[PDB]
């Protein structure tokens, strides 16, 4: 089991960490969702599907910077939604093919009324999402840590 980003950055067997830089809607109004879809950005596969089945959860999700201070919202994982930042581990997703498959995570963040101007700064860390991988074969329990950075400023009109 291993993963990589759309940019080619890999986290190999056994886990590790990587940086993910994402483009964001440049203007978001109060009450409107800023969508951060990582399913187009993070992909993983199973390295021996002939015998092994891999199980993958969103172990933890944390907020930082302008997201921590200026937004509230949710994370959607494989079709179900939970409060973000997270308070518990999600149910698992099955990986059973060598063909790369999206990690089905997306953030839905809405600006608070009191925010004004630039709510997220270009190049700043906005979130850390931890992928946890186990299997039905041995005692492997590996974590893949994705550090999510903003490519551009996000503006909230007051
Ligand atoms: C067939 O067993 C051989 O390969 C196993 C490879 O283990 C990696 O891939 C598994 C399937 O994606 C994943 O579950 C595991 O955590 C590793 O990422 C290895 O464990 C066996 O020991 C043997 O080498």
Curated annotation (Swiss-Prot):
Localisation: Fimbrium
Assigned keywords, A-Z: Fimbrium, Signal
Superkingdom as given in the UniProt entry: Bacteria
GO biological process: cell adhesion; cell adhesion involved in single-species biofilm formation; cell-substrate adhesion; mechanosensory behavior
The keyword DNA damage belongs to this UniProt entry's keyword annotation: no
Keyword check for Signal: yes
Family label: Belongs to the fimbrial protein family.
Protein name, UniProt field: Type 1 fimbrin D-mannose specific adhesin
Annotated source species: Escherichia coli (strain K12)
Residue numbers of the full-length protein present here: 22 to 179 of 300
